[PDB]
Amino acid sequence: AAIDECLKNAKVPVTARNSTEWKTDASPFNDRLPYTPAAIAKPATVEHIQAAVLCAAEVGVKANPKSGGHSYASFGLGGEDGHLVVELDRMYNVTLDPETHIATVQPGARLGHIATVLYEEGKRAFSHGTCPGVGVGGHSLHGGFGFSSHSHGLAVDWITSADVVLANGSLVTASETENPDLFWALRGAGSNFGIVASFRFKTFAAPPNVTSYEINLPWTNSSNVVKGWGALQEWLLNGGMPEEMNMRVLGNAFQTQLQGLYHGNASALKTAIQPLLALLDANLSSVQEHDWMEGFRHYAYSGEIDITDPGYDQSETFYSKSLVTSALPPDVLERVAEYWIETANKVRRSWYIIIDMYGGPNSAVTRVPPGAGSYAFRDPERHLFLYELYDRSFGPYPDDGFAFLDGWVHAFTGGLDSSDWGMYINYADPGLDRAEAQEVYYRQNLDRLRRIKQQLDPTELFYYPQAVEPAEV
Numbered sequence: 469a470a471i472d473e474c475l476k477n478a479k480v481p482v483t484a485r486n487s488t489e490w491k492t493d494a495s496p497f498n499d500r501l502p503y504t505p506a507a508i509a510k511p512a513t514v515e516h517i518q519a520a521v522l523c524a525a526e527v528g529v530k531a532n533p534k535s536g537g538h539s540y541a542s543f544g545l546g547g548e549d550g551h552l553v554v555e556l557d558r559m560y561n562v563t564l565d566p567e568t569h570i571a572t573v574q575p576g577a578r579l580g581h582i583a584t585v586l587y588e589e590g591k592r593a594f595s596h597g598t599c600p601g602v603g604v605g606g607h608s609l610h611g612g613f614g615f616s617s618h619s620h621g622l623a624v625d626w627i628t629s630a631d632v633v634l635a636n637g638s639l640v641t642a643s644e645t646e647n648p649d650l651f652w653a654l655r656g657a658g659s660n661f662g663i664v665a666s667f668r669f670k671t672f673a674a675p676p677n678v679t680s681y682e683i684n685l686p687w688t689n690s691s692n693v694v695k696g697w698g699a700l701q702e703w704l705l706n707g708g709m710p711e712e713m714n715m716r717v718l719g720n721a722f723q724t725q726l727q728g729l730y731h732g733n734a735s736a737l738k739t740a741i742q743p744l745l746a747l748l749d750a751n752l753s754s755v756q757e758h759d760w761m762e763g764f765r766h767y768a769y770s771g772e773i774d775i776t777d778p779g780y781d782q783s784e785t786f787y788s789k790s791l792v793t794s795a796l797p798p799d800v801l802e803r804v805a806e807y808w809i810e811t812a813n814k815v816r817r818s819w820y821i822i823i824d825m826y827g828g829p830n831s832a833v834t835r836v837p838p839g840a841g842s843y844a845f846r847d848p849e850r851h852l853f854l855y856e857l858y859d860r861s862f863g864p865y866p867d868d869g870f871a872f873l874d875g876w877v878h879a880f881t882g883g884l885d886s887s888d889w890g891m892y893i894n895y896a897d898p899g900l901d902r903a904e905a906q907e908v909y910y911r912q913n914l915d916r917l918r919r920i921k922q923q924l925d926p927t928e929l930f931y932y933p934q935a936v937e938p939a940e941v
């Protein structure tokens with residue numbers, strides 16, 4: 469078709485429709501949502517990215533970058549059939565300056581590879597998610613929370629500059645001192661404004677030791693959930709969690725536990741965690757000291773860490789939702805707990821809920837001031853918890869299944885003003901219509917995002933079904 473001929477004339481490498489590699493390059497992370505691209509560009513340099521974008525614009529098709537392909541909604545494929553997919557995973561080089569400790573990271577680099585290179589070359593790191601196969605592109609442009617985030621912030625907070633290919637093929641560099649409006653927009657909503665062709669990240673010196681631990685929670689009835697969660701949020705909100713401590717609740721039908729990573733040794737951990745244990749009347753278990761990379765591996769749930777193979781094909785079948793909330797009033801705790809015990813525990817699929825200890829007085833995430841970037845959730849009191857709700861099937865996903873997580877989220881949002889909750893596009897939820905998605909993902913920053921979208925991509929070349937809409941001018 470026209471897009472294929474345009475790419476050929478422009479000397480852009482592609483994955484041909486009738487090739488083995490099409491299957492891999494086109495594949496979703498979420499097997500519930502396959503889409504068939506119009507074509508797949510396979511750039512090895514920024515020039516190819518420019519040429520691919522220009523071809524999309526000239527021919528009249530939509531285009532989307534795909535970095536790691538982990539979008540829960542397959543938005544790296546366009547979120548619908550018939551987009552040019554700019555597959556970035558042949559571009560995964562990571563370079564670390566020995567002097568400034570700034571890393572230059574190609575946009576197809578996955579987190580495991582990044583972590584490995586930074587650590588092996590200079591004992592450096594930046595703050596990012598668990599899951600070594602996750603692409604740096606989608607992850608860092610919309611937040612990126614992990615087991616260093618209470619200590620060191622979101623992946624987006626370590627971005628120091630970026631080179632971007634705009635919808636008309638122009639090149640720009642964005643930083644605090646250059647195209648600062650674009651730099652603001654990128655840092656929370658980056659999928660909407662261009663294709664990032666190179667990232668520069670600051671780093672911190674990796675701690676020599678980290679200690680993983682677990683605290684099993686007796687959340688077997690609604691009363692225990694309410695009381696335990698009520699104590700836990702009160703503790704976090706009141707400054708109970710030290711900067712070195714990074715933690716979450718993981719819940720499923722069969723166990724609930726706190727899981728943490730303490731940036732320090734086991735004895736430091738025991739001392740630091742004692743007050744919470746006394747508050748919750750629980751005990752520590754599975755206390756394990758690690759070197760930095762062993763710490764990453766512990767929560768990676770992956771044999772492969774340093775992943776660079778374009779054959780990468782990890783996938784699951786699922787529905788997922790997210791939330792960001794303040795502390796919850798007890799009546800909301802009660803409804804959420806009732807749903808957990810009476811509904812979630814009886815759902816005959818592999819579901820889980822993660823509640824990250826996200827905000828509060830000591831969190832590096834919510835220390836970032838409210839004007840620093842488009843990412844919306846920076847208030848230390850109002851943005852206390854981050855949630856991932858995940859509903860996985862091993863056969864095909866049942867078409868009536870969505871009511872489960874939808875109902876659970878309603879138990880939260882019913883009792884919270886819209887100013888006290890939002891949602892997180894790194895757990896992209898295609899159940900949300902376009903208007904609602906923009907509002908819940910970006911909240912108070914939507915209006916400015918829409919203005920910058922009109923300035924930078926007025927034709928919506930980078931469209932997907934939950935993309936920011938250009939402001940009307």
Ligand SMILES: *Cc1cc2c(nc3c(=O)[nH]c(=O)nc-3n2C[C@H](O)[C@H](O)[C@H](O)COP(=O)(O)OP(=O)(O)OC[C@H]2O[C@@H](n3cnc4c(N)ncnc43)[C@H](O)[C@@H]2O)c(*)c1C
Binds near residue numbers: 596610613932
């Ligand atoms: C599958 C998976 C996802 C995880 C995992 N662990 C996470 C964690 O511990 N913390 C988190 O905060 N998030 C975790 N996630 C979710 C991922 O963070 C999100 O799914 C990311 O958005 C995925 O990034 P990526 O793998 O790059 O996904 P794509 O589908 O390729 O892109 C998503 C989105 O971003 C746009 N985009 C990609 N690349 C670019 C560039 N270079 N420039 C602009 N825009 C870009 C895409 O077009 C798309 O819209 C653990 C697991 C197992």
Ligand SMILES: *[C@@H]1O[C@H](CO)[C@@H](O[C@@H]2O[C@H](CO)[C@@H](O)[C@H](O)[C@H]2NC(C)=O)[C@H](O)[C@H]1NC(C)=O
Binds near residue numbers: 513561
């Ligand atoms: C990533 O970095 C490697 C260097 O480590 C680049 O590899 C070189 O590629 C050129 C031409 O493609 C070869 O002539 C060299 O021999 C390669 N060097 C080595 C040491 O292998 C590679 O080009 C870079 N990849 C990207 C996408 O930019």
Ligand SMILES: *[C@@H]1O[C@H](CO)[C@@H](O[C@@H]2O[C@H](CO)[C@@H](O)[C@H](O)[C@H]2NC(C)=O)[C@H](O)[C@H]1NC(C)=O
Binds near residue numbers: 923
């Ligand atoms: C490519 O896109 C950019 C932004 O969409 C255009 O640059 C802008 O041009 C306007 C007026 O022409 C200026 O007022 C802005 O300040 C520019 N923005 C930036 C970021 O440079 C650029 O003109 C476009 N190029 C073409 C050929 O259309």
Ligand SMILES: *[C@@H]1O[C@H](CO)[C@@H](O)[C@H](O)[C@H]1NC(C)=O
Binds near residue numbers: 675676677757758759
């Ligand atoms: C502590 O870290 C060092 C590397 O910094 C590592 O060699 C050692 O094994 C770690 N100790 C423990 C108990 O994990």
Ligand SMILES: *[C@@H]1O[C@H](CO)[C@@H](O)[C@H](O)[C@H]1NC(C)=O
Binds near residue numbers: 686688689691692
């Ligand atoms: C919840 O379980 C605890 C024991 O784990 C019990 O003491 C408590 O009474 C239970 N509450 C209700 C309402 O069943």
Ligand SMILES: *[C@@H]1O[C@H](CO)[C@@H](O)[C@H](O)[C@H]1NC(C)=O
Binds near residue numbers: 732733734735736
């Ligand atoms: C644990 O860390 C503390 C620093 O907080 C240090 O004083 C102590 O030496 C460490 N313990 C061991 C066994 O290294």
